Amino acid sequence: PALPAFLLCSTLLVIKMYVVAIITGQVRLRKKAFANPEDALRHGGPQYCRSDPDVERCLRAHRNDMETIYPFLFLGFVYSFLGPNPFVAWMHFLVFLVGRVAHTVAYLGKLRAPIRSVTYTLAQLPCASMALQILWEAARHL
Amino acid sequence: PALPAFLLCSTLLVIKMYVVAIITGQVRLRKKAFANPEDALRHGGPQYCRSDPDVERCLRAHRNDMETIYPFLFLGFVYSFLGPNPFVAWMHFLVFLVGRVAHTVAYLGKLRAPIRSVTYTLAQLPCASMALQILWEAARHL
Amino acid sequence: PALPAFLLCSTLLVIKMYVVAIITGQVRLRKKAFANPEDALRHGGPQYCRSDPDVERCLRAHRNDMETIYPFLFLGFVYSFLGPNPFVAWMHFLVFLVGRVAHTVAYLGKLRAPIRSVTYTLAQLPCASMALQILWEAARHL
Numbered sequence: 001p002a003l004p005a006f007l008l009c010s011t012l013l014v015i016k017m018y019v020v021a022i023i024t025g026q027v028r029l030r031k032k033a034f035a036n037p038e039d040a041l042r043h044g045g046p047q048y049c050r051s052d053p054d055v056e057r058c059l060r061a062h063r064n065d066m067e068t069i070y071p072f073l074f075l076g077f078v079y080s081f082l083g084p085n086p087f088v089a090w091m092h093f094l095v096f097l098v099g100r101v102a103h104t105v106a107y108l109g110k111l112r113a114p115i116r117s118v119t120y121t122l123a124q125l126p127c128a129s130m131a132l133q134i135l136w137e138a139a140r141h142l
Numbered sequence: 143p144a145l146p147a148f149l150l151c152s153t154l155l156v157i158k159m160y161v162v163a164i165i166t167g168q169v170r171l172r173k174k175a176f177a178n179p180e181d182a183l184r185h186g187g188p189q190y191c192r193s194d195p196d197v198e199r200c201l202r203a204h205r206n207d208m209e210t211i212y213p214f215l216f217l218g219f220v221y222s223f224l225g226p227n228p229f230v231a232w233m234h235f236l237v238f239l240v241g242r243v244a245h246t247v248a249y250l251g252k253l254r255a256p257i258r259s260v261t262y263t264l265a266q267l268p269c270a271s272m273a274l275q276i277l278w279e280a281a282r283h284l
Numbered sequence: 285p286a287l288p289a290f291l292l293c294s295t296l297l298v299i300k301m302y303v304v305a306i307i308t309g310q311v312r313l314r315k316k317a318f319a320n321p322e323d324a325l326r327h328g329g330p331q332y333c334r335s336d337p338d339v340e341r342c343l344r345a346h347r348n349d350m351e352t353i354y355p356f357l358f359l360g361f362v363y364s365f366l367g368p369n370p371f372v373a374w375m376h377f378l379v380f381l382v383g384r385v386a387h388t389v390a391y392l393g394k395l396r397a398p399i400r401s402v403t404y405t406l407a408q409l410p411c412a413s414m415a416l417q418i419l420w421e422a423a424r425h426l
């Protein structure tokens with residue numbers, strides 16, 4: 001029940017992080033409005049087009065997949081090499097990946113940060129679910 | 143001895159990566175100082191009442207909660223499920239962290255960087271202590 | 285021979301995420317021309333010798349250090365305590381680093397971004413072969 005609940009943590013959170021890494025940036029280096037009105041780069045905000053929705057997206061899209069990942073990686077992981085439980089694990093991949101993606105996607109389109117409202121808490125709250133499930137178990141093991 | 147040691151290392155960094163983020167989320171967004179001069183949402187350097195502290199404050203925390211984390215989790219864990227030692231495990235969590243938290247609320251409150259200069263050194267060395275205390279176990283094994 | 289592959293995983297990436305995090309702060313807080321023309325800080329971009337390469341390089345190395353870590357270690361951790369193979373986990377550990385070092389450094393140097401387009405695919409493709417090597421092997425442990 002253990003090792004498998006972890007398999008998909010690779011597949012799914014790769015997509016989540018590093019395929020959203022490979023899409024974003026790859027889509028960016030082709031669309032390059034950079035070499036902007038003659039520049040060395042840095043400073044994001046000459047035309048709206050170039051950087052306005054992108055500099056957020058590149059940051060946000062990176063932000064989202066950055067923020068969730070570690071809490072869902074390590075908290076799980078150092079609990080995961082200890083003999084933990086099935087169902088329990090599986091629902092975190094459903095609360096995290098779904099908690100994040102409805103978090104990530106809502107915050108990319110509509111520009112407004114308040115939209116990051118509803119899912120941002122769905123990401124915060126399996127960290128109340130994960131962290132403790134470690135604590136009582138590991139303490140149970142010893 | 144091993145698994146109680148890496149035990150409380152989840153909880154230090156659920157309060158530290160994710161309690162801090164949750165608050166710096168929760169209080170930032172309740173008094174939401176956005177919907178700014180009728181703006182499609184980005185930016186963050188007009189009103190001192192709005193951003194200056196917050197934009198510092200919030201990215202201050204994240205920037206600190208991320209950086210020392212990486213080489214604490216990664217570095218520790220390649221070396222955990224391997225065969226560790228106690229007073230050494232148990233310093234790294236307290237050395238790193240109190241190497242971080244008085245680095246993190248320091249740079250927080252008073253804006254001026256000088257502040258972070260000491261305690262950040264008090265944390266950096268731990269990545270070497272871990273580095274060498276990791277590598278020797280890694281050398282005993284071979 | 286598992287750990288054999290893994291023992292310099294921990295260390296070499298100290299040179300990457302925290303010996304680079306180190307000099308870059310050690311060096312910055314030191315060289316620092318902060319106190320910037322009368323300044324309670326935040327905002328790093330008046331005079332070039334002070335702000336432009338610094339704030340960039342600081343963050344140029346950083347953001348690059350950040351993004352190689354996760355797929356590499358986290359994908360490499362799950363599938364690690366599991367029964368892997370040296371060559372394999374030697375290919376993945378080597379190519380990534382020598383692919384990301386040319387990536388980080390490139391961008392780091394000539395302020396421009398287009399110089400990064402090259403080795404980040406030579407970083408992202410290991411992401412793609414590591415991410416499968418998890419699932420495949422991780423299907424053979426069940």
Ligand SMILES: N[C@H](CCC(=O)N[C@@H](CS)C(=O)NCC(=O)O)C(=O)O
Nearest residue numbers: 021022024025348351400404407408
């Ligand atoms: N949205 C892309 C993410 C692609 C990505 O994961 N790139 C990593 C290595 S492949 C990186 O260090 N890129 C930083 C850069 O844009 O130069 C980005 O611009 O960062």
Ligand SMILES: N[C@H](CCC(=O)N[C@@H](CS)C(=O)NCC(=O)O)C(=O)O
Nearest residue numbers: 067116119120121123163164166167
């Ligand atoms: N204050 C939060 C830090 C806490 C945190 O990790 N929040 C996550 C979990 S919802 C987030 O996706 N924040 C959305 C955002 O600000 O872009 C932040 O600005 O991001």
Ligand SMILES: N[C@H](CCC(=O)N[C@@H](CS)C(=O)NCC(=O)O)C(=O)O
Nearest residue numbers: 206209258262305306308309312342
């Ligand atoms: N160039 C330095 C790199 C040194 C570093 O890794 N600093 C981290 C870890 S102690 C930090 O907490 N930075 C806060 C700051 O930059 O003031 C930086 O600007 O951060």
